[PDB]
């Protein structure tokens, strides 16, 4: 038993991390088969980032201007192509450590593991959620650009995130592996509105189920509610509206615990209206929304 | 910027995980050079665990009774030896994925990453602290025994923990890699007192420094205190007494932020006496004590 915010094992991604240098800028790249993927702003100086013309900047670069190093192994760049906000560097060697992989664009509220890297070298791994407003609340210092987010299903790595930017507000923005930003953000050093975020209600509910399974049950009450009644509370407290699709995804957890989804909603309603009264749930003094229903089942079923 | 509970990259440990089966019991082993390390209670049935005579139970086992599988590769066991609470199975093949490694016995209050595994297969990685009472608050289901805890320094893996037991209270106990339990615990299915735990004060202070570095500063006050005055508060709130050794280890963080350690103690004193007033620090509504000063510097310096 016990419930932890758990990242996927990072080894399959570690074998794909490389260092990419273009002129004076060095960040991280992802080496899969004979292609290295990295943020296109590797071609920018610090001053270019105010208003870069990426097409013009890239035209001044040739294959030999990109230095790619996988640990001690230097790779030979034989083609380059910009796809949205990512650069794809064709190299002459297929990465022998390429795992089975897919590129996926995840939905807001889903979770993934981030392998934070600097100079092509992994430093740590953590689990986080894509916020409803398409930011992530990560840990990214200078040089972490090109670090990637991913999920693992058996032997297949689904890459979903590449880190590009820290907003002036301190939250993080990036792209899928086709180079399309999540959210409204652009790869330019300007102030950028993220817009109102909300709490991921279906994830909070999943975590409440995780809590019941592990013996934290004090928040279970004698009340029930309706979807529409609960959603009135959700709107007041800036929670995502709960849909039947969310109720359906919570089905297995409701079955395992014998607690109907709408009963759990009435517990959550009381928690929102009355707070936690100085108590904790699974070691937290706030309502946690970075575990999906799939995360809870995964961790509880091994 | 940003601050996350970050695990070490797990790949070097993933390459060492194997499945160990003895009779009906299957758990995880650690394959380093030509030795596989695992909990000795792999030789027990469910009923043996009430009061096992490990010496007598092991005498009934020969090398061929231990089945060791590294993924699809079956290993040949050519010797076996019990060292305290671990079994050491000599195999005929050196693990070609053996990282540079050491075995270390960590001190209470230090942190490490756990690679949770089932049937020899990694499922996730998380960071935790050794509690002052030598338990850990982990995520360990049936079959996770033999999962290991570790730190990484450059290219060297320092293994510090092997998981053995879930106490009836739901917390976790295990050994160093020489098989010596942390704490008073034994590998027997009986009720076992863990004893009073306390909060790791030097870690809370480190995390407050992490918070200041990242812009959370509301808890900084106009007061200061003394070591002895603060320790009077620490004792009232079941915090570890702060020593000069702790103050010294916080030195670099004090220098970086310009906040004297005893000034930070006065902030923490006010937080203990008055609570957090419905505010949060680094996204937490409680005082976090699972980051060491070294953890904070690591994450803040990349």
From Swiss-Prot, chains A, B:
Effect of residue 132 to H: In strain: Omicron/BA.1, Omicron/BA.2, Omicron/BA.2.12.1, Omicron/BA.2.75, Omicron/BA.4, Omicron/BA.5, Omicron/BQ.1.1, Omicron/XBB.1.5, Omicron/EG.5.1
Boundaries of every Peptidase C30 domain copy: 1-302
Active site: 41, 145
Outcome of mutating residue 205 to V: In strain: Zeta/P.2
Cytoplasmic topological segments: 1-302
Catalytic activity: TSAVLQ-|-SGFRK-NH2 and SGVTFQ-|-GKFKK the two peptides corresponding to the two self-cleavage sites of the SARS 3C-like proteinase are the two most reactive peptide substrates. The enzyme exhibits a strong preference for substrates containing Gln at P1 position and Leu at P2 position
Phenotypic consequence of residue 189 to A: Does not affect ability to cleave and inactivate human TRMT1
Activity regulation info: Inhibited by pyridone-containing alpha-ketoamides compounds 13a and 13b. In turn, alpha-ketoamide 13b (tert-butyl (1-((S)-1-(((S)-4-(benzylamino)-3,4-dioxo-1-((S)-2-oxopyrrolidin-3-yl)butan-2-yl)amino)-3-cyclopropyl-1-oxopropan-2-yl)-2-oxo-1,2-dihydropyridin-3-yl)carbamate) inhibits SARS-CoV-2 replication in human lung cells. Inhibited ex vivo by michael acceptor inhibitor N3. Inhibited ex vivo by compound 11a and 11b.
UniProt cross-link Glycyl lysine isopeptide (Lys-Gly) (interchain with G-Cter in ubiquitin), position: 5, 90
Compartments where found: Host cytoplasm; Host Golgi apparatus; Host nucleus
Protein name: 3C-like proteinase nsp5
Stated role: Cleaves the C-terminus of replicase polyprotein at 11 sites. Recognizes substrates containing the core sequence [ILMVF]-Q-|-[SGACN]. Cleaves and inactivates human TRMT1, preventing tRNA guanine(26)-dimethylation of tRNAs. May cleave human NLRP1 in lung epithelial cells, thereby activating the NLRP1 inflammasome pathway. May cleave human GSDMD, triggering alternative GSDME-mediated epithelial cell death upon activation of the NLRP1 inflammasome, which may enhance the release interleukins 1B, 6, 16 and 18. Also able to bind an ADP-ribose-1''-phosphate (ADRP).
Outcome when changing residue 145 to A: Complete loss of 3C-like proteinase nsp5 cleavage
Subunit structure: 3CL-PRO exists as monomer and homodimer. Only the homodimer shows catalytic activity. Interacts with host FBXO22; this interaction promotes the proteasomal degradation of nsp5.
Domain of life: Viruses
């Amino acid at each position: 038993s016990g419930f932890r915010k758990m990242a996927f094992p990072s080894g399959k991604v570690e074998g794909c991390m490389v260092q990419v240098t273009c002129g004076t800028t060095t960040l991280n790249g992802l080496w899969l088969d004979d292609v290295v993927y990295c943020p296109r702003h590797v071609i920018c100086t610090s001053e270019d980032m105010l208003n870069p013309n990426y097409e013009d900047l890239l035209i001044r670069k040739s294959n030999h201007n990109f230095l790619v190093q996988a640990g001690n192994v230097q790779l030979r760049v034989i083609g380059h192509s910009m796809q949205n906000c990512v650069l794809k560097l064709k190299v002459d060697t297929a990465n022998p450590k390429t795992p089975k992989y897919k590129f996926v664009r995840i939905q807001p509220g889903q979770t993934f593991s981030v392998l934070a890297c600097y100079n092509g070298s992994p430093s740590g791994v953590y689990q986080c959620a894509m916020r409803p407003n398409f930011t992530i609340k990560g840990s990214f210092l200078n040089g972490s650009c090109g670090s990637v987010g991913f999920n693992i299903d058996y032997d297949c790595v689904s890459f979903c995130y590449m880190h590009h930017m820290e907003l002036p507000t301190g939250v993080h923005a990036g792209t899928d592996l086709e180079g399309n930003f999540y959210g409204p953000f652009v790869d330019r050093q300007i102030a950028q509105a993220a817009g109102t975020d909300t709490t991921i209600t279906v994830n909070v509910l999943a975590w409440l189920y995780a809590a019941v399974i592990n013996g934290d049950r004090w928040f279970l009450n004698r009340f029930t509610t309706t979807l529409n009644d609960f959603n009135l509370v959700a709107m007041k407290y800036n929670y995502e509206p709960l849909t039947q699709d969310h109720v359906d995804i919570l089905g297995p957890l409701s079955a395992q615990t014998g607690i109907a989804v709408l009963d759990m909603c009435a517990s959550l309603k009381e928690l929102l209206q009355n707070g936690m009264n100085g108590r904790t749930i699974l070691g937290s003094a706030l309502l946690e929304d970075e575990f999906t229903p799939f995360d809870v089942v995964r961790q509880c079923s091994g």
